[PDB]
Design a binder for this molecule. Structure first.
Ligand code: PEE
Ligand code: SF4
Ligand code: SF4
Ligand code: SF4
Ligand code: SF4
Ligand code: FES
Ligand code: MG
Ligand code: ZN
Lengths: 97, 208, 112, 376, 115, 48, 176, 125, 96, 230
């Protein structure tokens, strides 16, 4: 910034913080608008062998949903859709705001 | 498999299959089918009479506790005798699980309103009526929610035209906005995209 | 004892053990009017008996909450009330009967 | 109306300035998105989700991409998932800034809006650098992301992130301890946990009443199970607690952004499956299979196996879900869009009982409603 | 038996009674609609238009369809009474800006290809 | 150019008073910038 | 893991009670807010002097559409109609026929700019880099008709903006 | 308890369709013919419903193709012919149904290319 | 290679000019008709035919990945030159 | 009857003697990938796209030419069949020109569709491609022979259906070419059907060239009135 030191001190007193440390104007710390070209690495399937598509075909491994107790067609403990959710733990970083 | 293929979760698959068996055993009067998809989503098919008992059981049972109605919508399949597929999506916060309840209806058969089970169902049922024409009996206030006042037809039906039947413009002679039959300067261009070769042999149907 | 449940509208319940015992006894007595071979009756009786046995065997509220896996026993009381209401509604509905009707030949066929 | 967000016709019955009844009339921004999607390929239908919630664009892109990927049974590469989470947290920052500043504007604190929209402009610069568009980027696609990050983007994101905290501090200095703000927000629109659950609420509208629920924690997606953050919880279920929760969620998003910046891995950006994701342009101009797959993916698109899924994420406004039905072809059969704003505005009349006109304005502000997702 | 679930009415007589009640409500409402919306038409024109709209569906013989038509008519009346409709919506029933399309064969032959 | 200004004020153009056919002493607009200086001015590149 | 936002209790000692009473009677937090606004008053504003100064953009930026040429002056477009097929808004209308020398070229190439969503799907689908979204965004008009571009308008846009377009593509083609 | 209606299904009054597009439309029910440019047959499995073609004209500006019938792009898919017929009847549309065409089974024999005395013998491979 | 019609309207590269009796001319009154002056057919006609010493030549339009898909052109016929289907450049084997 | 019993992926099928594997597969509603096979032409068996695995048989067979034996179990979606299809498509695409944007067959190409369905998604061919000169066979059928895959469908149609023996192959190996070997016009009242039978854009309609794409055309089924055949 180009503010005089007296105005800077007035700003810090009014805000109660060191304003020059964190500036909203971002003068020169940003990256250059011109950059070197990027190499850009390939995916795992860029192989010359052992790469048949039938071994990596996720779309063709989908199948219709499993049918459970269609209507057309002991102990027997009760069940839940999933195990009960575990209780959350209070934060160690900052439990109370 | 590995890098590009979605991994499986057998534990959730067995848990959902077991809970579907549980629900089917508890409510044989209404449950017609239970399905588990390969990405671990549980679907329960019910008779239309069982909309209220099944949802109430899933909300209030200690082992179900599906206290949240995530979504309620309809799907239009004109080829079926019962045109409209009514889909309920529920979430259980106690058990970190989701469930889907599905039923059916046609143009003239009312479906029971679920506002007594879930208060969220009010606007969802209003939207289903507005978009598909499915009437919900005992709905506290059923009326159009998304369409213009006086709008005729149900746009989300498969036989409703994409651009509708009427368009709006301002007319200076009558000093108001008027509605007139649609004319398009450019007609929407229909594309035939489907390949004549079958893609997924796992879903091939019998040749009749 | 506890100052707040942390959930809006859920008041702190003094003497939770007696409330839970009363609610579970009411649930069992309502289930007693349901046919013996009904799956709902047997499943709910099993889980209610387990919870009642846990309640009768632990006087500490925090450890009872830990055992019940129910999240702050006030919510356990609310769940028991919901179960009692569901039991009465189920007794009215009689869902243990055979399927009311079969769907149309191709009602659930997808695709198309 | 300045407080009606442009397209909300709220029919209210008043006794004096006390609000007897709230009857929200919607559809003034209903464009028939769900019917239009049926006439598009999945790639062609992707940009609609940018315009569903136009304050959280990449989050809707991520939700739709996850639904399509789940139907396709494919997996995005790890670097794409890390970029998705980083940009989703940036989007959460943008959304919470918009929500808080517009809320304060409706009550009357008009100054923090100007302070925070400069940060919003910098985040739009990030979107434009990564995708070429300021808001409707369309960067997140089924299979990964469209393009890799340009060199130098991470450094600028780090520079912005190391300073956003002081802007949060200045906002919180202007609003949190002010007695006028507390008088306008404390004990206004109080909702109980049971009512919130039964009315279909999600997100902050659930966490403000003490419900411990967050989809990024309970049902993690992408790499959200690899980052550490806290979930703010309210206790009074009112406007002030939800304000505090949103501010703390901004802080936690900054924390997640730091973790994502330090953990960015190398590798490809879209799934290495040319039947789903288009190949690189050099490959398309060099090899026969790449050209064929480019042609077919940009004319017909990829076929999706038949099935129906409901995929939901923790959007900045709540649970954003898609019920996507596939009939086996390259065009979706049905696409139902679930918006938290729908249910939240459906519960507006319940929350406004016993309150006044300004209180109803504050409740509209605290529900964090954008009508693109409400009307669709 | 045809095994169909009803909506409101068991047969056509109760459907006719509901139709008559809806017609009475619309007939009562018409003058208030003319006054509130500041319409340039007369009360007789509005009541004639209501009669025309009712007689448009006179051929219906299915009680369920009649019940749904009555439900839609009550929705329209509730929209009109609450002034949710505007003057444009009310005047859309009259088609005042659409040219009268001829019905005879020769005129259709002259104007274009539509049957 | 003035690199001591913050990002956005470090580059600016003083428009001409007479372009192709019109007097632009007061009537100036952003479309008067030629493409190369358009690229430099909008910081799409660091090279004039 | 979670945290509470409004679960702190104020101390009831005479010191704290007197401090709170002084806060109530003397309006200290209001003065703090005034001080923050005064601090912002003396800061340098973020306003730029448009149109003399411009907002920063990227080579990836999507602006006005243009049709490009080969270095010989030949049109790059080969009427493959990939952009028309992929266009999510159906904003592209293409007709083609063999040219007088037998070349595959367009006779109609229209982009309805009021239908367009500027998504860049068309320039992705193009296999010969013929259709691009340029860097220009200042092309507002006074009539609707001026925003219905035909092939001549797009070719003129390409001829007018090629110097910037080629440089923008050169900086980004290795990311594509 | 049920009411036992005894009339054929008709929902024309509830669909919001103008009278012109109910009584003057002709829908065709058919299985689409195989595109002869390709050998794939996956597009000849289902039944289709399409409306009669109406007038298209050039727009005075841009020379685009204009239309005035809202049903010019409406295509429905059915699993059987009876489902399509029922849909058309309950919607009140006059329909024409074309029977499905299946290619007849054919007798292919590779050895016939090299016959001792028949004309099926090929002069080239 | 712009050319004017007997009415004075500039004929575009696609050859479309309004008929003298066409009312649609009125849209250009008090305004102009947008016409691109760089006719691509004439521009590609000015390019010389490249002499190469092989029966098959490769063309990608120049610029590597900034051109068009790479195609291979047969040059066996001495009666006619080998033209690229993408770029329009011409190639031939040494004769005479 | 005289029918024999065969299995297609374990499903019993009753077929007449002399039925091929391809026909048995199509009786259960599966279409075997094919390039050279046309049900109205003679069986060629050259493209090798229809190779399929028979259970308990080490070597895959050509489904278009092989009569199915009783008790055979045709495994149409096993690893062997899929890898055979991928290899055949790789060999077909090795020398094929990158002409899809300028090819009229684009969007309705059997090569494209069967590459998308049964082939791999990338290339490992690192050599140069072959290019052949074009043949002038008339003003109706446009000829770009670099796209030819040597199916020989056109030759068989000319010989058998049109009764004209003017088409053939010259050379051998990679240099085999489809044409007339002389400047000759294939002018016949049925000559235009070679455009339809050709799977690729090697033979295309000259009056229709470059004007449209398959996905944008609307199909109207009608009747021809140019003669009394209907
Ligand atoms: C030895 C004998 C001495 C005799 C006695 C003298 C001692 C007197 C000591 C006490 C004096 C206190 C005077 C203050 C009067 C009002 C203070 C007050 O309490 O008002 C506030 C409310 O007042 C406000 O907060 C102001 C609201 C509007 C703010 C507008 C801007 C703030 C002012 C900016 C700076 C003020 C400068 C004023 C002077 C300018 C120069 C002329 C109370 O509201 P609540 O906190 O909500 O509590 C109510 C329930 N308990
Ligand atoms: S940018 Fe998108 S909407 Fe615009 S013309 Fe290209 S593809 Fe169409
Ligand atoms: S602009 Fe590109 S994609 Fe569009 S038709 Fe021309 S060559 Fe094809
Ligand atoms: S024949 Fe088929 S694969 Fe070959 S260039 Fe033409 S469209 Fe592409
Ligand atoms: S021209 Fe066509 S039909 Fe003839 S051999 Fe070549 S690809 Fe086969
Ligand atoms: S189809 Fe059998 S080898 Fe060609
Ligand atoms: Mg062909
Ligand atoms: Zn070239």
């Amino acid at each position: 910034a180009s503010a005089t030191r007296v105005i800077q001190l007035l700003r810090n007193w009014a805000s109660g913080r060191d304003l020059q440390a964190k500036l909203q104007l971002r003068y020169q710390e940003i990256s250059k608008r011109t950059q070197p070209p990027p190499k850009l690495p390939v995916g795992p399937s860029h192989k010359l062998s052992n790469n048949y598509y039938c071994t990596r075909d996720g779309r063709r491994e989908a199948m219709p949903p499993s049918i459970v107790m269609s209507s057309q067609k002991t102990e027997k403990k009760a069940v839940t859709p999933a195990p009960p959710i575990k209780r959350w733990e209070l934060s160690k970083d900052q439990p109370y705001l | 498999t590995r890098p590009t293929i979605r991994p499986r979760n057998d534990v959730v698959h067995k848990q959902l299959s077991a809970f579907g068996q549980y629900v089917a055993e508890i409510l044989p009067k209404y449950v017609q089918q239970v399905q588990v998809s390969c990405f671990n989503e549980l679907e329960i098919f019910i008779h239309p009479d069982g909309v209220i008992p099944v949802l109430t059981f899933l909300r209030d049972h200690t082992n179900a506790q599906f206290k949240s109605l995530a979504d309620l919508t309809a799907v239009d399949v004109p080829t079926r005798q019962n045109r409209f597929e009514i889909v309920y999506n529920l979430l259980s916060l106690r058990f970190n699980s989701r469930i889907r309840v599905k039923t059916y209806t046609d143009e003239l058969t009312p479906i029971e309103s679920s506002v007594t089970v879930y208060k969220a169902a009010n606007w969802y049922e209003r939207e289903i009526w507005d978009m598909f024409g499915v009437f919900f009996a005992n709905h506290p206030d059923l009326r159009r929610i998304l369409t213009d006042y006086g709008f005729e037809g149900h746009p989300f039906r498969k036989d409703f035209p994409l651009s509708g039947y009427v368009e709006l413009r301002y007319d200076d002679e009558v000093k108001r906005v008027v509605a007139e039959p649609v004319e398009l300067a450019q007609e929407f261009r229909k594309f035939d995209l489907n390949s004549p070769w079958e893609a997924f042999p796992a879903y091939r149907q019998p040749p009749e | 004892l506890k100052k707040t449940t942390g959930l809006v509208g859920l008041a702190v319940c003094e003497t939770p053990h007696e409330r839970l015992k009363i609610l579970y006894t009411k649930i069992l007595d309502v289930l007693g009017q349901i046919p013996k071979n009904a799956a709902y009756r047997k499943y709910t009786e099993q889980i209610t008996n387990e919870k009642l046995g846990m309640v009768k065997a632990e006087p500490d509220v925090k450890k009872l909450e830990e055992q019940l896996q129910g999240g702050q026993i006030e919510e356990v009381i609310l769940q028991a009330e919901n179960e009692l209401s569901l039991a009465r509604k189920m007794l009215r509905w009689k869902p243990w009967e055979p399927l009311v009707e079969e769907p149309p030949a191709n009602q659930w066929k997808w695709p198309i | 109306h300045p407080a009606a967000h442009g397209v909300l016709r709220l029919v209210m019955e008043l006794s004096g300035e006390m609000v007897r009844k709230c009857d929200p009339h919607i559809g003034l921004l209903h464009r028939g998105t769900e019917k239009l999607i049926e006439y598009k390929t999945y790639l062609q239908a992707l940009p609609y989700f940018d315009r569903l919630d136009y304050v959280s664009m990449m989050c809707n892109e991520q939700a739709y991409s996850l639904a399509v990927e789940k139907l396709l049974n494919i997996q995005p590469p790890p670097r794409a998932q890390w970029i998705r989470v980083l940009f989703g947290e940036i989007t959460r920052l943008l959304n919470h800034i918009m929500a808080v500043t517009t809320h304060a504007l409706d009550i009357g604190a008009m100054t923090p809006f100007f302070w925070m929209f400069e940060e919003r402009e910098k985040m739009f610069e990030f979107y434009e650098r990564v995708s070429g568009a300021r808001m409707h980027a369309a960067y997140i696609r089924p299979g990964g992301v469209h393009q890799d990050l340009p060199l130098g983007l991470l450094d600028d994101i780090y520079e912005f992130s190391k300073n956003f905290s002081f802007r949060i501090d200045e906002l919180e200095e202007m609003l949190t301890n002010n007695r006028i703000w507390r008088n306008r927000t404390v004990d206004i629109g109080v909702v109980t946990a049971e009512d919130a659950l039964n009315y279909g609420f999600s997100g902050v509208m659930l966490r403000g009443s003490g419900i411990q629920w967050d989809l990024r924690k309970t049902q993690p997606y992408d790499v959200y199970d690899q980052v550490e953050f806290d979930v703010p919880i309210g206790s009074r279920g009112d406007c002030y607690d939800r304000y505090l929760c949103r501010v703390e969620e901004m802080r936690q998003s900054l924390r997640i952004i730091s973790q994502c910046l330090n953990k960015m891995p190398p590798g490809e950006i879209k799934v290495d499956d040319a039947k789903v994701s288009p190949p690189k342009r050099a490959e398309m101009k060099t090899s026969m299979e790449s050209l064929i797959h480019h042609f077919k993916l940009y004319t017909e698109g990829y076929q999706v196996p038949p099935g129906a899924t409901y995929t939901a994420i923790e959007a900045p406004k709540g649970e954003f879900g898609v019920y996507l039905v596939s009939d086996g072809s390259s065009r979706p059969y049905r696409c139902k869009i679930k918006a938290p704003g729908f249910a939240h505005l459906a519960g507006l009349d319940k929350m406004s009982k016993g309150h006044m006109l300004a209180d109803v304005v504050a409740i509209i502000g605290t529900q964090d409603i954008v009508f693109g997702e409400v009307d669709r | 038996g045809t095994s169909v679930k009803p909506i409101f009415s068991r047969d056509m007589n109760e459907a006719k009674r509901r139709v008559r009640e809806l017609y009475r409500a619309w007939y009562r409402e018409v003058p208030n609609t003319v006054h509130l919306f500041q319409l340039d038409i007369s009360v007789k024109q509005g009541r004639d238009k209501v009669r025309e709209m009712f007689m448009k569906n006179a051929h219906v013989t299915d009680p369920r369809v009649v019940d749904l038509l009555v439900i839609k008519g009550k929705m329209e009346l509730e929209e009109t009474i609450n002034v949710w409709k505007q003057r444009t919506h009310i005047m859309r029933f009259f088609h005042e800006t659409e040219a009268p399309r001829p019905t005879d064969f020769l005129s259709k032959f002259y104007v274009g290809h539509d049957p | 150019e003035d690199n001591k200004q913050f990002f956005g004020r470090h580059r600016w153009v003083i428009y001409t008073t007479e372009m192709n056919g019109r007097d632009t002493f007061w009537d100036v607009d952003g479309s008067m910038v030629p493409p190369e200086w358009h690229r430099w001015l909008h910081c799409m590149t660091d090279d004039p | 893991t979670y945290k509470f936002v409004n679960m702190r209790e104020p101390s009831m000692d005479m010191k704290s009670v007197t401090d709170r009473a002084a806060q109530t009677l003397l309006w200290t937090e209001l003065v703090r807010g005034l001080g923050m606004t005064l601090s912002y008053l003396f800061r340098e504003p973020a306003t730029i002097n448009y149109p003399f100064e411009k907002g920063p953009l990227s080579p990836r930026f999507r602006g006005e559409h243009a049709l490009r040429r080969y270095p010989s002056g030949e049109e790059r477009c080969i009427a493959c109609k990939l952009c028309e097929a992929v266009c999510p808004a159906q904003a592209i209308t293409i007709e083609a026929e063999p040219r007088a020398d037998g070349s595959r070229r367009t006779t109609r190439y229209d982009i309805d700019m009021t239908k367009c969503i500027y998504c860049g799907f068309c320039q992705e689908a193009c296999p010969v880099d013929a259709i691009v979204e340029g860097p220009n965004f200042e092309f507002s008009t006074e009539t609707h008709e001026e925003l219905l571009y035909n092939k001549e308008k797009l070719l003129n846009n390409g001829d007018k903006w090629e110097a910037e377009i080629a440089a923008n593509i050169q900086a980004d083609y290795l990311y594509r | 308890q049920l009411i036992a209606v005894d009339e054929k299904l008709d929902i024309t009054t509830l669909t919001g369709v103008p009278e012109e597009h109910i009584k003057t439309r002709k829908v065709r029910i058919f299985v689409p013919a195989r595109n002869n440019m390709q050998s794939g047959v996956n597009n000849t499995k289902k039944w289709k419903m399409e409306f009669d073609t109406r007038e298209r004209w050039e727009n005075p500006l841009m020379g685009w193709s204009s239309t005035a019938d809202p049903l010019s792009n409406l295509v429905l898919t059915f699993s059987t012919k009876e489902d399509a017929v029922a849909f058309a009847e309950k919607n009140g549309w006059s329909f024409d149904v074309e029977e499905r065409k299946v290619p007849k089974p054919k007798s292919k024999s590779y050895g016939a290319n090299f016959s001792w005395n028949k004309r099926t013998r090929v002069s080239t491979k | 290679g712009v050319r004017t019609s007997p009415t004075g309207e500039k004929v575009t590269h696609t050859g479309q000019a309004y008929d003298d009796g066409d009312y649609r001319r009125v849209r250009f009154s008090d305004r102009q008709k947008e016409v691109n002056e760089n006719f691509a057919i004439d521009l590609i006609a000015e390019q010389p035919v490249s002499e190469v010493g092989s029966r098959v030549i490769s063309c990608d339009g120049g610029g590597g990945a900034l051109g068009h898909p790479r195609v291979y052109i047969n040059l066996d016929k001495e009666t006619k030159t080998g033209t690229c289907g993408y770029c329009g450049l011409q190639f031939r084997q040494p004769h005479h | 009857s005289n029918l024999i019993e065969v299995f297609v992926d374990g499903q019993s099928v009753m077929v007449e003697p002399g039925t091929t594997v391809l026909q048995a597969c199509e009786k259960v509603g599966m279409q075997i990938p094919r390039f050279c096979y046309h049900e109205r032409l003679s069986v060629a068996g050259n493209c090798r796209m229809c190779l399929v695995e028979i259970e308990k048989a080490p070597k895959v067979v050509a489904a278009c030419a092989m009569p199915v034996m009783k008790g055979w179990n045709i495994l149409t979606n096993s690893e062997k069949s899929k890898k055979a299809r991928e290899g055949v498509m790789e060999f077909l695409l090795a020398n094929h020109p990158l002409d899809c944007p300028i090819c009229d067959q684009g969007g309705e190409c059997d090569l494209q569709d069967q590459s998308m369905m049964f082939g791999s998604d990338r290339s490992r061919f690192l050599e140069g491609k072959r290019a052949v000169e074009d043949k002038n066979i008339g003003p109706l059928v446009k000829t770009i022979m670099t796209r030819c895959i040597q199916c020989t469908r056109c030759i068989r149609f000319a010989s058998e259906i049109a009764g004209v023996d003017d088409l053939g192959t010259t050379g051998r190996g990679n240099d085999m070419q489809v044409g007339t070997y002389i400047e000759k016009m294939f002018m016949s009242e049925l000559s235009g059907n070679i455009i339809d039978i050709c799977p690729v854009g090697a033979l295309t309609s000259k009056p229709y060239a470059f004007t449209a794409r398959p996905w944008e055309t609307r199909k109207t089924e009608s009747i021809d009135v140019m003669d009394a055949v209907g």
